């Protein structure tokens, strides 16, 4: 089942990115302005959902960039997998 396979890849990647985001915001903002993990989950899923509320964001030199870098990579990485998911839907139709 390829449909299944890429569904998995999507989920895996999402999970990975969420994890990287939690782990990303965890050690940094924990210094200057302390934030709970749920705030991170929020931010991550707020970034990959393309929402961007802005209640709390990075105020620090590296902190923004790191989030940014992860997004930029994600924004390339995001469609790769959606693109993938599309390819199978085309195979299923065939």
UniProtKB/Swiss-Prot annotation:
List cystine links: none
| UniProt PTM comment | Phosphorylated by protein kinase C. Phosphorylation of the C-terminal domain increases channel activity.
Residues recorded as binding K(+) 1, renumbered to this chain, are 51-52
Q: Which residues lie within the membrane without crossing it?
A: 37-57
Organism superkingdom: Eukaryota
Residue intervals annotated with topology Extracellular: 30-36, 58-61
Q: Where are the transmembrane segments?
A: 7-29, 62-83
Localization per record: Cell membrane
Q: How does it assemble?
A: Homotetramer; which constitutes the Na(+)-activated K(+) channel. Interacts with KCNT2; these heterodimer channels differ from the homomers in their unitary conductance, kinetic behavior, subcellular localization, and response to activation of protein kinase C.
Function comment: Sodium-activated K(+) channel. Acts as an important mediator of neuronal membrane excitability. Contributes to the delayed outward currents. Regulates of neuronal bursting in sensory neurons. Contributes to synaptic development and plasticity.
Query: Would you identify the family this protein belongs to, as annotated?
Result: Belongs to the potassium channel family. Calcium-activated (TC 1.A.1.3) subfamily. KCa4.1/KCNT1 sub-subfamily.
Query: Any notes on this protein's domains?
Result: The cytoplasmic gating ring domain of the closed KCNT1 channel harbors multiple K(+) and Zn(2+) sites, which stabilize the channel in the closed conformation. Under low-Na(+) conditions, the abundant cytoplasmic K(+) ions stabilize the gating ring domain in a closed conformation. The open KCNT1 structure contains at least two Na(+)-sensitive sites in the RCKs where Na(+) binding induces expansion and rotation of the gating ring that opens the inner gate.
Q: Give the protein name, as stated in the record.
A: Potassium channel subfamily T member 1
Q: Which organism is it from?
A: Gallus gallus (Chicken)
Q: Which residues of the full protein are shown?
A: 244 to 337 of 1201
């Amino acid at each position: 089942s390829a449909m299944f396979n890429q569904v998995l890849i999507l989920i895996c990647t999402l999970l990975c990115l969420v994890f990287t985001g939690t782990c990303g915001i965890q050690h940094l903002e924990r210094a200057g302005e302390k934030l709970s993990l749920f705030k991170s989950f929020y931010f991550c899923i707020v970034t990959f959902s393309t929402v961007g509320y802005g209640d709390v964001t990075p105020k620090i030199w590296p902190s923004q960039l790191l989030v940014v870098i992860m997004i930029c990579v994600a924004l390339v990485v995001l469609p790769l997998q959606f693109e993938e998911l599309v390819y199978l839907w085309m195979e299923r139709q065939k």
